[PDB]
């Protein structure tokens, strides 16, 4: 993939992971089990 970054600064794409957390069942409050939205990043540096 060719990134359209023309600023040639080190770039950092990010992805959003799938939720692998159990939820809440029945009348139980959402608060009893919050899920964690995780973002993963990677940085690309230039080379001369």
């Amino acid at each position: 993939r060719l990134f359209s970054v023309a600023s040639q600064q080190p770039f950092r794409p990010r992805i959003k992971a799938q939720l692998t957390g159990s939820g809440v069942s029945g009348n139980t409050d959402f608060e009893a089990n919050y899920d964690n939205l995780e973002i993963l990043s990677q940085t690309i540096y230039p080379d001369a």
Binding site: S22, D29, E31, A32, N33, Y34, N36
Partner: protein
């Protein structure tokens, strides 16, 4: 200074009538942060033990964590627990006859203070 903490806490109170048998007192979710288990005997027992412990929702995974003879009539677990598939707090009374010395039936009360598995991020 930044961390994740459990911000949700529940207390479950359940009574049983202190005679031989097994009782499923408190239900806990996976990842629950059990921080206090207390057992109390209301009345004057004459003979018997109460053993509270953990067991599965279905299968026979009972294991006592706190044993109470007749005399002290109150106890608290000395240990803290993260719920890992042992999602039943249960209590069994192996020896017990009728109330004894009172004429009024003997009660046992179990209170379970536990924190929910959910976490939030806080910095101080």
């Amino acid at each position: 200074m930044k961390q994740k903490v459990h911000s949700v806490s529940y207390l479950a109170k359940a009574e049983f009538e202190y005679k031989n048998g097994v009782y499923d007192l408190v239900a806990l979710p996976t990842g629950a942060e059990v921080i206090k288990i207390s057992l109390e005997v209301v009345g004057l027992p004459t003979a018997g033990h109460v053993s509270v412990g953990f067991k599965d929702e279905s299968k026979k995974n009972y294991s006592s964590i706190l044993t109470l003879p007749v005399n002290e009539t109150s106890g608290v677990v000395t240990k803290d627990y993260t719920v890992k598939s042992d999602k039943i707090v249960a209590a069994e009374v192996k020896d017990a006859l009728a109330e004894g010395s009172d004429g009024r039936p003997v009660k046992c009360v179990l209170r379970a203070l536990y924190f929910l598995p959910s976490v939030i991020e806080v910095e101080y």
